[PDB]
Design a protein around this ligand. Structure first.
Ligand SMILES: [Mg+2]
Ligand SMILES: [Zn+2]
Ligand SMILES: [Zn+2]
Ligand SMILES: [Zn+2]
Lengths: 50, 46, 49, 42, 55, 50, 50, 66, 99, 99
């Protein structure tokens, strides 16, 4: 719900201003998933990781 | 006593406790997922 | 629209353009970009950072 | 000006894992070929 | 052993990024900073068998 | 710079001799005008002119 | 990537940081604002005196 | 994924309107009549239901189920 | 399938019908709390297949029981003497209907 | 007299009032004056209000008439030239050929 106006001086060059009380109600909320993988193997000599 | 894994398809509880190959006791499926932890965790409603 | 100031309480002079626009949030986030190095590992060949 | 001997540089300027630096593999080849000539001529 | 205390309680620990060896007994540093390879030379990595490298 | 996702570095000189040179020679106050022809470069930008 | 152009004239340094930039019109033109998390990494070795 | 409880802009509780909204649509009201009969005046609220995309009905088909 | 942080975020927004003039501010720390400055609710459901269900296999509402978690399922858990100070039914989430 | 604009506050040229302060009174006066302007302008403009919309771009009444009139005249003259060339009656400009 945007307004097009000059306001507060922290918005000069392509910066923009958000409403704190919307961020609290869910706006712009997100998730970030990352991955971590590992493997165990058997060597040519008869031994293996544990 | 041994740890339990959930088969990826039929969700039948399995147990390994060994160097055995990962295979479902019931079906042919070959993917296993660990169970949820038993401890409680505390979150903030923010 | 006609708008009232939220800080002073007295109405603004101009009329303000108001309405719905579709905004999308990009993947560039500052938390994944901050960085600083006091003193750390050095390369073996030339012993610069 | 015409050379008949060479220096092998220290291990500092060619680390262990490049497995070894190509300067090392070059040098081991030079000596190998040199040894070939001397036994071969003998 | 700690050069300042003689005690042998050295613990391997790291600050935010620096890896270091610290006498936990007295709060002293005895070694820090490491030299490692990078990713730029990782792509150039070859391999030679020890048999090839030993004749 | 334009605050559209930019980034900037920063260095912290480690010697009392280097502090004195940075402040005296490289300070902003001493560099309000560009040496190409002497015109001012640090002045007001949009939304302060309006 | 040779010695001259890569390691002698211009080279990597430490005690430095990097981050996004954003606006603030309540700083004097000669001050810069630094986050606390980057103030906790960087140091200056102040000698003790009277 | 699921219905947000509150309207972001003003804070009105819209989380309890989704089922009724689909009910009123299912009786061949228009969208405009549906929203008006649910009592969503301000347009900041109307988008909160109008432009929703309910993915939890779909995402559940892929869930592990007996 | 709802992530825990997101579920906790949703639960916060639900307005509670306690009168706020009867309680003090929790002091910093003291996470355990006490009967003068805290309230407790409990949520617990288990979705199960409906055994009586016929063979249409189409309507989720008929096929399952408690396959929806409304704010009806929150039960007030009195703490200390609050059960006595407050008559029954005056502590509850306001709307009774939120999903 | 007058009013302040880029020619008197902007980063382009001399006659900048911050430049006069720099040369005549030192560095500290020019650095201080800029700082006060940073704190003082936003407080005015953000409570006056200043906006742009599509009312600031829609063309009025007289504009449409002038535009239509001009287009007709221009195309006719363009026609006249291409008629002149393809008939070969066109006089060549004294720096080039007909094309
Ligand atoms: Mg930019
Ligand atoms: Zn299985
Ligand atoms: Zn010690
Ligand atoms: Zn609303």
């Amino acid at each position: 719900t945007v307004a097009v106006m000059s306001y507060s001086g922290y918005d000069i060059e392509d910066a923009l201003v958000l409403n704190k009380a919307s961020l609290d109600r869910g706006f712009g909320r997100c998730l970030v998933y990352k991955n971590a993988k590992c493997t165990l193997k058997r060597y040519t000599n008869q031994t293996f990781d544990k | 006593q041994p740890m339990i894994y959930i088969c990826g398809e039929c969700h039948t509880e399995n147990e390994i406790k060994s160097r055995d190959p990962i295979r479902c006791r019931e079906c042919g499926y070959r993917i296993m997922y660990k169970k949820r932890t038993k401890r409680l965790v505390v979150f903030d409603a923010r | 629209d006609y708008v009232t100031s939220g800080i002073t309480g007295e109405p603004l002079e101009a009329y303000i353009y108001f309405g719905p626009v579709y905004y999308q949030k990009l993947k560039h986030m500052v938390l994944d970009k901050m960085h600083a190095r006091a003193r750390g590992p050095r390369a073996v060949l030339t012993r610069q950072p | 000006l015409i050379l008949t001997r060479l220096l092998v540089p220290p291990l500092c300027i060619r680390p262990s894992v490049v497995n070894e630096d190509d300067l090392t593999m070059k040098l081991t080849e030079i000596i190998f070929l040199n040894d070939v000539i001397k036994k071969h001529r003998i | 052993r700690c050069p300042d205390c003689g005690s042998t309680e050295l613990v391997e620990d790291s600050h935010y990024s620096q890896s270091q060896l610290v006498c936990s007994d007295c709060g002293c540093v005895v070694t820090e900073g490491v030299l490692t390879t990078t990713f730029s030379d990782e792509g150039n990595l070859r391999e030679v068998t020890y048999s090839r490298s030993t004749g | 710079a334009d605050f559209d996702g930019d980034e900037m570095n920063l260095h912290l000189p480690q010697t009392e001799e280097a502090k004195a040179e940075a402040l005296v020679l490289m300070g902003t106050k001493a560099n309000l005008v560009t040496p190409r022809n002497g015109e001012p470069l640090i002045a007001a930008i949009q939304d302060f002119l309006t | 990537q040779g010695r001259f152009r890569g390691n002698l004239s211009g080279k990597r340094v430490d005690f430095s940081g990097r981050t996004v930039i954003s606006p603030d019109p309540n700083l004097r033109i000669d001050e810069v604002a630094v986050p606390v998390h980057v103030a906790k990494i960087l140091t200056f070795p102040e000698k003790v005196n009277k | 994924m699921i219905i947000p409880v509150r309207c972001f802009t003003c804070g009105k509780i819209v989380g309890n309107k989704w089922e009724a909204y689909l009910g009123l649509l299912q009786a061949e009201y228009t969208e405009g009549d549906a929203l008006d009969a649910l009592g969503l005046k301000r347009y900041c609220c109307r988008r909160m239901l109008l432009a929703h995309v309910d993915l939890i009905e779909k995402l559940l088909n892929y869930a592990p189920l007996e | 399938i709802v992530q825990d942080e997101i579920l906790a975020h949703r639960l916060g927004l639900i307005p509670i019908h306690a009168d706020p003039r009867l309680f003090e501010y929790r002091n910093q720390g003291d996470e355990e709390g006490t009967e003068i400055d805290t309230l407790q609710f409990r949520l617990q459901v288990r979705c199960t297949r409906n055994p009586h269900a016929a063979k249409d296999s189409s309507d989720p509402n008929e096929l399952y029981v408690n396959h929806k978690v409304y704010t009806r399922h929150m039960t007030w858990i009195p703490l200390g003497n609050q059960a006595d100070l407050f008559p029954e039914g005056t502590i509850r989430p306001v709307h009774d209907d939120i999903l | 007299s007058g009013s302040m604009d880029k020619g008197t506050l902007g980063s382009g040229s001399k006659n900048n009032i911050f430049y006069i302060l720099l040369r005549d009174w030192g560095q500290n006066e020019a650095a201080d004056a800029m700082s006060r302007l940073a704190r003082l302008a936003p407080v005015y403009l953000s409570n006056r209000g200043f906006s742009i919309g599509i009312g600031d771009v829609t063309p009025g009444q007289g504009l449409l008439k002038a535009k239509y009139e001009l287009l007709n005249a221009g195309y006719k003259k363009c026609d006249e030239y291409i008629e002149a060339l393809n008939t070969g009656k066109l006089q060549q400009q004294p720096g080039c050929t007909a094309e």
